[PDB]
Structure 1
Amino acid sequence: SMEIRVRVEKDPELGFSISGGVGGRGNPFRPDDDGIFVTRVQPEGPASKLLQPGDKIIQANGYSFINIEMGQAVSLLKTFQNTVELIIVRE
């Protein structure tokens, strides 16, 4: 795996969906991982060609997503304006 930095600019949203979280309902890639996983990406949205299903988000605008709950991850990402700098784990 690898740590990739991507910048997704809200227009007006980031354009992707996430699954997982600590105590959450899991993810379709690695069930033994309570991390946050990109699950669906809008074909021509702000995250298109930048994020892919399976991406594990471990940092968003300097905020670590390790041991984060889903409700908190969604809350944080909706709070950010403009661009969100992500650090993702990609195969």
Structure 2
Amino acid sequence: GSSGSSGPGLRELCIQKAPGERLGISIRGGARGHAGNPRDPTDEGIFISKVSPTGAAGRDGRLRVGLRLLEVNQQSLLGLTHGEAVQLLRSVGDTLTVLVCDGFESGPSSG
């Protein structure tokens, strides 16, 4: 009957990029980094803080600034710190598996 999105978000997704291209994405958080959630300081979650247009994601169409990073390449970011988590995203060959999902829209975008 009624339908709005009609698409998965918290499922297993991946980003196909060149054999040596940098994703070109940004994230904010960490087991220590400033509490990702401005509401509760006891939150070390990690969510995208920015995404490059020329990056594998920016072009992909599924990766945006607001998708909470659940796991990168079947590697839960739970336990590691921003520094570690980040390196985990760039530690992929030409394609990774992100389990992100619609977390919060950061307004309209261009391109």
TM-score (norm 2): 0.67
**Which residue number corresponds to residue 9 of structure 1?**
16
Offset of residue 41 of structure 1: 1.2
Cα gap change, 1:44/1:50 in structure 2, threshold over 3 Å: closer, same or farther?
Answer: farther
Q: Which amino acid counterpart does residue 98 of structure 2 have in structure 1?
A: L
Q: What residue is the counterpart of 2:95 in the other structure?
A: 83
Higher relative contact order (CA 8 A, sep 6+): 1
RMSD: 1.9
TM-score by length of 1: 0.79
Matching of residues 1-91 of structure 1 within 5 Å: 3-11=10-18, 12-27=21-36, 30-31=37-38, 32=40, 33-48=43-58, 49-91=61-103
Higher strand share: 1
Query: Which deviates more, 35-44 or 50-59?
Result: 35-44
The structural deviation recorded for 1:89 is 3.0
Superposed CA offset, 1:5-56 (max 9, x none): 32123441112101111111344xx333312111111224210221111111
Alignment check: 8 A CA contact 2:23 2:90 kept:
no
CA contact (8 A) 1:61 1:84 kept: yes
Post-superposition CA distance 1:51-83 (Å, at most 9, x none): 111111011111112343111112222222111
* Unaligned residue ranges in structure 2 (runs of 5+): 1-8, 104-111
Gaps of 5+ in 1: none
